[PDB]
Amino acid sequence: DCFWXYCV
């Protein structure tokens, strides 16, 4: 699931 400048 995506964090603010990092998609994981």
The experimental method, as deposited, was NMR
Partners of 3 in the β-ladder: 6
On the 0-12 / 13-18 / 19+ scale of CB atoms within 10 A, 7 is exposed
Residue carrying the six token digits 């994981």: 8
Query: Which residues, other chains included, contact 8 with Cβ-Cβ below 8 Å and sequence gap of 6+?
Result: 1, 2
Q: What is the 3-state secondary structure (H, E, C) of the chain?
A: CCECCECC
- For residue 1, the one-letter residue type is D
